[PDB]
Amino acid sequence: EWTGDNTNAYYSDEVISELHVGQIDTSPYFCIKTVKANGSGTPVVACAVSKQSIWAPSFKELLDQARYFYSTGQSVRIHVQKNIWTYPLFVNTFSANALVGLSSCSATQCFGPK
Amino acid sequence: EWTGDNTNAYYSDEVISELHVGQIDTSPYFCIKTVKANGSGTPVVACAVSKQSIWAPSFKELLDQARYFYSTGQSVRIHVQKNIWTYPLFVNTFSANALVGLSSCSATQCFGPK
Amino acid sequence: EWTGDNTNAYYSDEVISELHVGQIDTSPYFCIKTVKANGSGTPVVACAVSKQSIWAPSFKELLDQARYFYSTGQSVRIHVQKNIWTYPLFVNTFSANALVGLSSCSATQCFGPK
Amino acid sequence: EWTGDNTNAYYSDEVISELHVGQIDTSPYFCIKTVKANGSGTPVVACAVSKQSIWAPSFKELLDQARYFYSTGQSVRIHVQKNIWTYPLFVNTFSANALVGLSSCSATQCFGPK
Amino acid sequence: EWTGDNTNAYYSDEVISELHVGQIDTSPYFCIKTVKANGSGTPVVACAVSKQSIWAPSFKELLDQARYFYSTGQSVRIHVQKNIWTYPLFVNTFSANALVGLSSCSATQCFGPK
Ligand SMILES: CC(=O)N[C@@H]1[C@@H](O)[C@H](O[C@@H]2O[C@H](CO)[C@H](O)[C@H](O[C@]3(C(=O)O)C[C@H](O)[C@@H](NC(C)=O)[C@H]([C@H](O)[C@H](O)COC(C)=O)O3)[C@H]2O)[C@@H](CO)O[C@H]1O
Ligand SMILES: CC(=O)N[C@@H]1[C@@H](O)[C@H](O[C@@H]2O[C@H](CO)[C@H](O)[C@H](O[C@]3(C(=O)O)C[C@H](O)[C@@H](NC(C)=O)[C@H]([C@H](O)[C@H](O)COC(C)=O)O3)[C@H]2O)[C@@H](CO)O[C@H]1O
Ligand SMILES: CC(=O)N[C@@H]1[C@@H](O)[C@H](O[C@@H]2O[C@H](CO)[C@H](O)[C@H](O[C@]3(C(=O)O)C[C@H](O)[C@@H](NC(C)=O)[C@H]([C@H](O)[C@H](O)COC(C)=O)O3)[C@H]2O)[C@@H](CO)O[C@H]1O
Ligand SMILES: CC(=O)N[C@@H]1[C@@H](O)[C@H](O[C@@H]2O[C@H](CO)[C@H](O)[C@H](O[C@]3(C(=O)O)C[C@H](O)[C@@H](NC(C)=O)[C@H]([C@H](O)[C@H](O)COC(C)=O)O3)[C@H]2O)[C@@H](CO)O[C@H]1O
Ligand SMILES: CC(=O)N[C@@H]1[C@@H](O)[C@H](O[C@@H]2O[C@H](CO)[C@H](O)[C@H](O[C@]3(C(=O)O)C[C@H](O)[C@@H](NC(C)=O)[C@H]([C@H](O)[C@H](O)COC(C)=O)O3)[C@H]2O)[C@@H](CO)O[C@H]1O
C-alpha cells in the first residue's frame, strides 16, 4: 500500500486548524482538523491511532509532521483513507478518516501524490 | 477505555501554566497545572506516570503535547480520569487525576470529545 | 558505503522548498524538493524510506535534519544515490533518488563530501 | 523513591545558566548550572547520567526538560539528591548532585514538592 | 574514560558554524565545524559515528546538543579526542576528531572540564 493510491482521498490547500491527542483501547492517537486556506469548502477531520489500521507504522512520523505543519500554519495537502475507524462515539466526535499523508503546497502546486 | 469516555472529566478553555517532571517508583512522570484562560475558576492539576495506570502507553505523546501547549500558552481542553494516583504525598502535592487527553480549543469550540 | 562515495550525486546551494511525509509498503517515508537558491537549474527530489535501502539506518536523522534545514530555508548541499526506489508510480510522483546526506553551506563552501 | 522525598533537596527561583553534555565510563551525561534569578545565593550544579543511579529511568525526560527550561530561561525549581556521583574529577568539575526533578515557577508558588 | 580526560583536547569560545549528517558503514554519523567567536584561530572539525569508537553511547545526546547549539549560535567549548577516525576519504573531508562533549560558555568561563 501507498499514500498515493487512488483508493485514498486528499484535499489541497488546507491549513491544520485544530489538534487533539488522546488514548483509545491501549493505543495513543491524535486527530487534526483542517480548513481551506481560502475560507471555502467544509472541514476535514482525520486521525491516526498508533497500533491500528494499516497506517499504524506511520503514527509517530504523521504526528510529528502534523505538529510541525500545525505550528507554521502553511498551505498543505492532506491525505486520508475513508471509513477506517469504527468506534461510533469516536467517529462521532472526530470522523472515520485515517491520516495517511501530508504534503506542503506552494500557491501553484502541491508536493504529493495526485 | 477512551479519552472521550463519560467516566472521565474535562475542563474547557484552560491554558497550561505549570509543568514539572520527576520520577516515582522507577518511573518517569510529569504533572501540569491549568488555569482558566480568563483566570477565574479553580486550577486543574493532572499527571501521567510512564509505567502506571491504563494510560501509560500514551505517556510520551501526552508529555510532548503538554509541552507544546505549555509553550504556546494557547487555550485547550484538558481531560483527566480522577482518583487514579494513590501515593498520598504525591496526591497531596499534585492530584489523583490521570491526564488522558489534550485538545486544542478555538474561540468557537474545542476539538475533542464532549 | 558512505554518503561521499563518488558513486553518489550531490547538489550544492539548494533550498529545501517542499516536504511530504507518507507511508509506502509498511514503511513511513518522507521526500523533499530542493530548489536552487535563485531559480536556476532544475529541482531535485529525494526520498528516505524507513527500513528500506542500505540507507535505512539514517532515516530518522535525515528526517529531523531535513525538518530543520526546511524550517530555516538556509543553503544546503543535498546528497543522493540515484536509481534506488523502483516503484514506477512513486518514482514518477517523486524520484528514484535516495537521500543519503545533508550539509550546511557558507557563502563559499558547503560542509561535506565533494 | 521519589523526587519529592524529604531526603532530597531543592532550590526555588533558579534559572538554568549553563548546560553541558558529555560521557563518563560508558554513559552519556549532562550537567546544568543554576543561579537565582535575583543574583542571590551560590550557583547549583546538578547532573544526570544515563544507566547510572536510581534516577537513571528519568534521564531523557529530565534532559528534554532541562534543555527546554534552558532555552526559555524561566524561573524554575531544581530538585536534586546530593552525594550520588563519586568520580572525583567529575564532581570537582560539576558536583555530586544528581538531578531528580524540574519544576516550573510562576507568580505564585513553584509547581512541585515543597 | 571521560570527556574531560587530559588525553582529550578542547577549544573554548567557539561557535558551531556548520552541521552535516550522513551515513557510513551502516552507521549514521554527523560532523560539525567550529570557529572562534572572535574570528581568531583555525576551525575545528569533529564527528560522531553511531556504531564505533568508545564515544558511541553518547552519539544521540551529542547530535541533539550540537543541533541546539548550532541553532542558537551561542559560544561553546568543544571537546574532542584526536586521531579516532581512520578512513582516509572521510578524514580528508572532515577530521579524525571524535566529538566527546559540549559546554555552554559565558563571556568569562565555560561550564565544563578544563
Ligand atoms: C479558478 C477557480 O475558480 N478554482 C476553484 C477551486 O476552489 C477548486 O479547485 C481546487 O483547487 C485545485 C484545482 O483548482 C485542486 O484541484 C482541488 O481539487 C481537489 C484537491 O483538494 O486537490 C481534488 C481532490 O481529489 C478532491 N478530494 C476529494 C475527496 O474529492 C478535493 C475536494 O473535492 C475539495 O478540496 C473539497 O474538499 C472539501 C472537504 O471541501 O479537491 C480543488 O479543490 C474547484 C473545485 O472543483 O472549484 C473552483 O471554482
Ligand atoms: C466486507 C465485510 O463486511 N467483511 C467482514 C467484516 O465486516 C467483519 O468485521 C470485523 O469483525 C471483527 C470481529 O469483531 C472486528 O470487530 C472488526 O472491528 C474492529 C476490530 O476488532 O478490528 C473492532 C474494534 O473495536 C475496532 N477498534 C476501534 C478503536 O475502533 C477495530 C478498529 O476500528 C480497526 O482495527 C481499525 O480500523 C480498521 C477497519 O482496520 O475494528 C470488524 O471490522 C470481519 C469479521 O467480523 O470480516 C468479514 O467477515
Ligand atoms: C491500602 C492498599 O494498599 N490497598 C491495596 C489496593 O488499593 C491495591 O491496588 C493498589 O492501590 C494502592 C493504593 O490504594 C496502590 O496504588 C497500589 O500500588 C501502586 C503501584 O506502585 O502500582 C503504588 C503507587 O504509590 C502508586 N503510584 C502513585 C503515583 O500514586 C500506584 C499507582 O497509583 C497505580 O497506577 C494504581 O492506580 C490505578 C487506579 O491504577 O499504585 C495499587 O496496586 C490492591 C493491589 O495492590 O490491593 C491492596 O493491597
Ligand atoms: C534567609 C532568607 O533567605 N530570607 C528571605 C527569604 O524569605 C527568601 O528565601 C528563600 O525564598 C524562596 C521563595 O521564593 C524559598 O522559600 C527559599 O526556601 C528554599 C527553596 O529554595 O525552596 C527551601 C529549600 O529547602 C532550600 N534548599 C536546601 C538544600 O536547603 C533552599 C535553599 O536554602 C536556598 O534556595 C538557597 O540555596 C542556594 C544554593 O542558594 O531555600 C527561601 O530560602 C527570599 C525572599 O526574598 O530571600 C530572603 O529575603
Ligand atoms: C578580547 C579579545 O579580543 N580576545 C580574547 C582572547 O584573548 C581569547 O583567547 C582565548 O582565551 C581563553 C580564556 O582565557 C583561552 O585562553 C583560550 O585558550 C584555549 C581554549 O580554547 O580553551 C586553551 C586550550 O587548551 C587550547 N586547546 C589546545 C588543544 O591546545 C585552545 C587552542 O589552542 C585554541 O582554541 C586555538 O585552536 C585553534 C585550532 O584555533 O585555546 C584562548 O583561545 C578569546 C577566545 O579565543 O576571547 C577573548 O577573551
Author numbering:
A (entry chain E), B (entry chain D), C (entry chain B), D (entry chain C), E (entry chain A): 24 to 137
Which sentences from the paper describe this structure?
Typhoid toxin belongs to the bacterial AB toxin family and consists of two enzymatic ‘A’ subunits, CdtB (cytolethal distending toxin A subunit; nuclease) and PltA (pertussis-like toxin A subunit; mono ADP-ribosyltransferase) linked to a homopentamer of receptor-binding ‘B’ subunit PltB (pertussis-like toxin B subunit), resulting in its unique A2B5 configuration. PltB recognizes the specific trisaccharide motif as its receptor, N-acetylneuraminic acid (Neu5Ac) α2–3 or α2–6 linked to the underlying disaccharide, galactose (Gal) β1-3/β1–4 linked N-acetylglucosamine (GlcNAc) or glucose. The pentameric configuration of the receptor-binding PltB subunit per toxin and the three glycan binding pockets per PltB monomer play an essential role for multivalent interactions between the toxin PltB and glycan receptor moieties. We previously revealed the three glycan-binding sites (BS) per PltB monomer and demonstrated the flexible use of these three binding sites in accommodating glycan receptor moieties that are structurally different.
To gain insight into the underlying mechanism behind the binding affinity difference between 9-O-acetylated and unmodified glycan receptor moieties, we solved co-crystal structure of PltB homopentamers bound to Neu5,9Ac2α2-3Galβ1-4GlcNAc and Neu5,9Ac2α2-6Galβ1-4GlcNAc, respectively. 9-O-acetylated α2–6 glycans bound only to the BS1, while 9-O-Ac α2–3 glycans bound to the BS1 and BS2. In close-up views of the interface between the PltB binding pockets and the glycans, we found that there are more interactions between PltB and 9-O-acetylated α2–3 glycans than between PltB and unmodified counterparts. Most notably, the 9-O-acetyl group forms an H-bond with Thr65 (via the main chain of Thr65) in the BS1, which is absent in the interface of the BS1 bound to unmodified α2–3 glycans. Likewise, Lys59 and Arg61 form H-bonds with Gal and GlcNAc of the receptor moieties respectively, which are also absent in the interface between PltB and unmodified counterparts. Water-mediated interactions in the BS1 via Tyr33, Asp36, and Arg100 to unmodified α2–3 glycans were not observed in the BS with 9-O-acetylated α2–3 glycans, presumably due to the additional three H-bonds on the other side of the binding pocket that make Tyr33, Asp36, and Arg100 out of reach. Overall, the three additional direct interactions between Thr65, Lys59, and Asn61 and all three saccharides of the glycan receptor moieties correlate to the markedly increased binding affinity of PltB to 9-O-Ac α2–3 glycans. The interfaces of the BS2 with unmodified and 9-O-acetylated glycans were overall comparable, but with the 9-O-acetyl group making a noted accommodation through a hydrophobic interaction with Ile103 residue in the BS2. With regard to the PltB BS3 that has been shown previously to bind to Neu5Acα2-3Galβ1-4GlcNAc, the 9-O-acetylated glycan counterpart did not bind to the BS3 in either 30 min or 2 hr soaking conditions, respectively.
